[PDB]
């Protein structure tokens, strides 16, 4: 007697006929859909390794809205009629990299690479809300993303090129 859960991932419709309320979006992406760009870093919202963009038509604002979220804490059961964009949704080396992906790589903003998808999606989400952000908006976009390798300097430098 369960309703089907319907959401989108990278533009593609997902119809889940047996949604478990306990299932996190991160588990679903990694272990059901096989999209493993989105990572587990902590499972408690602190690290941003699992960051994705969520998009929905907000019926109260009469508007399509885009925001970032931690996949590790998002229950799939909150996502009926929501669209998910992961790192694989915005570009790849087999097609064309998104400018966000190109600049973090070329600026030496990726060392081990594990935090890179989460940071890419935080920056992506900002640009989708504000195509011409200021330098300050850029720094604040990453309060939820941790990087242990780089010391952050190169990531900010490469992304500062999106500012004005």
């Amino acid at each position: 007697t369960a309703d089907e859960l319907v959401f989108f991932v990278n533009g593609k419709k997902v119809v889940e006929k047996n949604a478990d309320p306990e299932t996190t979006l991160l588990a679903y992406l990694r272990r059901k859909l096989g999209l493993r760009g989105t990572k587990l870093g902590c499972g408690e919202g602190g690290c941003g390794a699992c960051t994705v963009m969520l998009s929905k038509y907000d019926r109260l604002q009469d508007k399509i809205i885009h925001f970032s979220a931690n996949a590790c804490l998002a229950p799939i059961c909150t996502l009926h009629h929501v669209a998910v964009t992961t790192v694989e949704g915005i570009g790849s080396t087999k097609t064309r990299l998104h400018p966000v992906q190109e600049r973090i790589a070329k600026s030496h903003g990726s060392q081990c690479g594990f935090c890179t998808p989460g940071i890419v999606m935080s920056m992506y989400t900002l640009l989708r809300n504000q195509p011409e952000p200021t330098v300050e908006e850029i720094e604040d976009a990453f309060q939820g993303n941790l990087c242990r390798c780089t010391g952050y300097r190169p990531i900010l430098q490469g992304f500062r090129t999106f500012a004005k």
Binding site: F8, G11, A19, P21, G45, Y57, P75, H80
Partner: protein, 334 residues
């Protein structure tokens, strides 16, 4: 080290389209949904009415909006809630309403929406009306990340009732009004010391749900600060965080009202009631500074073995934060 002149330019019109199929589905009228798992049944409520009935029918059913607290409880604290209701779709719990006395936010409103709304209020309105709003914004400044703030609800933080909630001390100090409902019942209360009776508990009935929260405009001769400790070492204790309010008799520096509310000094958000009561009718001067600090030192004193340690540091912060408030009020009084 790299050459930005060679980067691909950004083309904002060439982004992945919002799924047209999804857009077509937005016309479909919302209805209650039921999901069934190994251990949990989840009901997505489409209407406030549905929510109140479900809660009357199942008073133990757990509400979830952002899951930023329930997800932790389930994963790390071993908690299991066999029935969950998600009210996120309900318009009443998402409404942002401008009234005579303040700005009301539905309880499912994300902290990002609150921050946006308040930032707009602060840019538009006279400084003198936005003292509490700015207190709220200061607490939201270095609070999590964009990811958490976009899904964490205002009501979720309040009802979670962590001793170290950075928002509850501000809401208590400002007597922020809470509209609380069940099937039949509707009541509004300003948040005060009694709203948090014990650890992780609030003054709600088993069926009741928090509907909306009204954050007050400040009045003439009314000033507000909020501060927080910049370290956290234990899961939900021993991080000092406060809301501080003073109202003066018209055009004076004579205390008419005073509220100093603290997180991280006990197993709940508390008000330094005994200390503040003693300052009524007193003037905003060195003597008041000395008496408040003495009151705070006593009323909030921590046993050497208090949970969370940092005993001296925390006492010192309670006082140092009041000192900052004291000086800030002096600057504001001109």
């Amino acid at each position: 080290l790299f050459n930005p002149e060679e980067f691909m330019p950004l083309d904002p019109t060439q982004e992945p389209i919002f799924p047209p199929e999804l857009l077509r589905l937005k016309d479909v009228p919302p209805k209650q949904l039921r999901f069934e798992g190994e251990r949990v049944t989840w009901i997505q409520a489409s209407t406030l009415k549905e929510l109140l009935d479900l809660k009357a029918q199942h008073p133990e059913a757990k509400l979830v909006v952002g899951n930023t607290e329930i997800g932790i409880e389930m994963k790390f604290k071993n908690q299991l809630f066999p029935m969950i209701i998600c009210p996120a779709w309900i318009p009443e719990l998402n409404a942002v309403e401008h009234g005579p006395e303040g700005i009301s936010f539905g309880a499912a409103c994300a902290l990002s929406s609150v921050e946006k709304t308040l930032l707009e209020a602060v840019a538009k309105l006279p400084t003198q009306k936005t003292e509490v709003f700015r207190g709220v914004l200061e607490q939201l400044r270095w609070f999590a990340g964009k990811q958490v703030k976009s899904v964490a609800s205002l009501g979720g933080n309040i009802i979670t009732a962590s001793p170290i909630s950075d928002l509850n001390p501000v809401f208590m100090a400002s007597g922020t009004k809470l509209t609380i409902v069940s099937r039949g019942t509707r009541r509004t209360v300003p948040m005060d010391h009694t709203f948090f009776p014990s650890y992780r508990k609030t003054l709600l009935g088993p069926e009741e749900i928090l509907l909306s929260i009204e954050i007050p405009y400040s009045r003439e001769d009314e000033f507000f600060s909020a501060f927080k400790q910049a370290s956290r070492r234990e899961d939900d204790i021993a991080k000092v965080t406060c809301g501080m309010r003073v109202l003066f008799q018209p055009g004076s520096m004579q205390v008419k009202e005073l509220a100093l509310c603290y997180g991280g000094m006990a197993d709940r958000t508390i008000s330094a009631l005994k200390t503040t009561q003693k300052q009524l009718s007193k003037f905003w001067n060195e003597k008041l500074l000395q008496d408040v600090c003495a009151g705070l030192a006593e009323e909030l004193s921590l046993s050497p073995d208090a949970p969370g340690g940092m005993i001296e540091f925390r006492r010192t912060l309670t006082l140092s934060f009041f000192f900052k408030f004291y000086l800030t009020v002096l600057k504001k009084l001109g």
